[PDB]
């Protein structure tokens, strides 16, 4: 884990918040399961020195890998002799509060996703609906003069969904005078310019 080969491969191209999610799948055979876990491991990664006992060779990736390997969970399942293995549906009891996110991480296309997913998902659970298209978040094109961009969701997966329902009315900014939004002023397109 702390070798140069792993640093060049799973620490360079990714964000810290994505490096946590990849290290969880690599050294623990599972995905991060709670928002408090992500805060702890990110605060472990982010600081230059954390130290545990005595010595301070604990920076970023080195400190995070030590924290992951010395965890209570690791030395209770893959203790001291066993190469860690995927604890997917067959092996253990599967949690359901991150089913779709975790089974995307377990796939071998997981490193191809650079946008963090688990910290976003655990943040979405405790906040109102984000404003986007009622369908997936990649359905609204870039707002340029003549682009029609429409990010692909296959070139670089950044899939984001949200239960929108049918009566949720989007909030749009008025490109002009604020008091003519047509939601608090039924006749606003007919007053001046």
Partner 1 sequence: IEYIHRRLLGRPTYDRVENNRYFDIASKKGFYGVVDAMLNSNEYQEVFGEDVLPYERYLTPAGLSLRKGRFGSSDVLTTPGGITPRGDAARMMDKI
Partner 2 sequence: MQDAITAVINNYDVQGKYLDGAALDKLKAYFTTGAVRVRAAAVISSNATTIIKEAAAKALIYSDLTRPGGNMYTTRRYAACIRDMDYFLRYATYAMLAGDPSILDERVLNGLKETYNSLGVPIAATVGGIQAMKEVVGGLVGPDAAKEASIYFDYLSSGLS
Partner 3 sequence: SVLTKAIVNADAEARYLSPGELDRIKSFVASGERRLRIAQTLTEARERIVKQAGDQLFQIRPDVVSPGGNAYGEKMTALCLRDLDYYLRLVTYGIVAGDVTPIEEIGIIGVKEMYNSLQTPIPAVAEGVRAMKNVATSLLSGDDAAEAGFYFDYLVGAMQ
Residue from the set 7, 26, 40, 160 that interacts with partner 2 by CB under 8 A:
160
Q: How far is CA 168 from CA 125, 135, 160, 165, in A?
A: 18, 12, 17, 6
Nearest to partner 2 of 53, 127 (CB atom): 127
- CA-nearest of 123, 29, 16 to 59 is 16
Pairwise CA distance, residues 144 & 167, whole Å: 28
Per CB under 8 A, residues contacting partner 3 are: 177-179, 183-186
Per CB under 8 A, the list member of 72, 173, 178, 192 interacting with partner 1 is 173
From the list partner 2, ligand CYC, partner 1, none, pick the one residue 107 interacts with, judged by a Cβ distance below 5 to 8 Å according to partner type.
none
| Contact pattern from residue 142 through residue 171 relative to partner 1, giving x for each residue in contact according to CB under 8 A and a dash for the rest | xx----x-x-------------xxxxxxxx
CA distance 95 to 92: 9
**By the rule CB under 8 A, 125 interacts with partner 2:** yes
Residue 86 DSSP label: -
Q: What is the DSSP string of 98-162?
A: THHHHHHHSSTTGGG--S--HHHHHHHTTS-PPPS-SS-GGGSPP-SSS------SSSS------
The nearer residue to partner 1, 111 or 188, going by C-beta atoms, is: 188
- Indicate which single residue of 13, 52, 57, 95 sits in contact with ligand CYC (rule: CB under 6 A): 95
Q: 76-135: which residues touch partner 1 (CB under 8 A)? A: 131-135
CA-CA distance, 86 to 104, in Å (whole number)?
A: 13
Q: Which stretch binds partner 2 (CB under 8 A): 24-32, 65-73, 74-82, 92-100?
A: 92-100
Please give the Cα distance from 171 to 126 (Å, whole number).
Answer: 20
175 binds, among partner 1, partner 3, partner 2, none (CB under 5 to 8 A by kind): partner 1
Binding site for partner 1 (CB under 8 A): 131-135, 139-143, 148, 150, 164-176, 189
Binding site for ligand CYC (CB under 6 A): 15-17, 39, 42, 89, 93-96, 119, 144-147, 171, 173-174, 178, 181, 183
């Amino acid at each position: 884990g702390k070798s140069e080969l792993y640093r060049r491969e799973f620490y360079q191209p990714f964000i810290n918040s994505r490096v946590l999610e990849l290290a969880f799948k690599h050294f623990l055979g599972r995905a991060p399961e709670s928002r408090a876990e992500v805060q702890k491991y990110f605060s472990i990664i982010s600081s230059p020195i954390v130290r545990g006992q005595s010595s301070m060779p604990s920076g970023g990736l080195y400190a995070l890998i030590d924290a992951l390997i010395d965890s209570e969970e690791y030395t209770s399942i893959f203790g001291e002799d066993t190469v860690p293995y995927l604890r997917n549906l067959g092996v253990e009891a599967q949690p359901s509060w991150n089913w779709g996110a975790a089974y995307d991480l377990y796939n071998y296309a997981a490193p191809r996703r650079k946008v963090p997913q688990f910290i976003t998902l655990f943040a979405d659970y405790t906040q109102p609906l984000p404003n986007q298209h009622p369908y997936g978040a990649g359905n609204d094109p870039l707002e340029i003069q003549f682009g029609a961009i429409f990010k692909n969701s296959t070139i670089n997966p950044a899939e984001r969904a949200a239960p929108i329902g049918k009566d949720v009315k989007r909030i749009l900014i008025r490109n002009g005078s604020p008091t003519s939004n047509e939601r608090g002023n039924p006749t606003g397109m007919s007053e001046g310019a």
